């Protein structure tokens, strides 16, 4: 039960963690890292394959699957 709350409700400590965590995430060299994670949604496009000539953006947008993907 990880809890998601309104951003406003959040405690300073709660905020503290998020700020530090994201900042560290930014640094994260790993594929799990933030920059890498960002690429999932859009450019660089990963969808057809991570290395493919034509790449499309990962958007199952305009589809029923859309909420699940997000």
């Amino acid at each position: 039960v990880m809890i998601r709350k309104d951003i406003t409700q959040l405690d300073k400590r709660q905020q503290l963690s998020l700020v530090k965590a994201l900042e560290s995430m930014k640094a994260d060299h790993s594929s799990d890292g933030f920059q890498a994670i960002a690429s999932f949604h859009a450019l660089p496009p990963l969808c057809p394959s991570p290395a493919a000539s034509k790449r499309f953006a990962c958007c199952v947008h305009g589809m029923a699957t859309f909420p699940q993907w997000h």
Binding site: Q9, L10, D11, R13, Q14
Partner: protein, 69 residues
């Protein structure tokens, strides 16, 4: 009295969290001043400070009591 509160929490601490935290608070030494409240007249607020033998004095803290005739 059929009424409820949307949430029961104190400053973001879970009830379980609260209990755990309180035990931790005990972990460190603490000094307290105890006040016996005899009963005042009209409402009044009290401020107290601790003064050293040297004569330095620091505002200890304050509390108030509500009252009337």
């Amino acid at each position: 009295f059929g009424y409820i509160y949307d949430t029961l929490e104190f400053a973001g601490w879970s009830i379980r969290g609260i209990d755990h935290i309180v035990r931790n608070r005990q972990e460190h030494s603490r000094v307290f001043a105890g006040f016996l409240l005899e009963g005042f007249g009209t409402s009044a607020t009290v401020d107290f400070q601790v003064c050293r033998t040297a004569g330095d004095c620091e505002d200890a803290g304050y509390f108030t009591v509500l009252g009337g005739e």
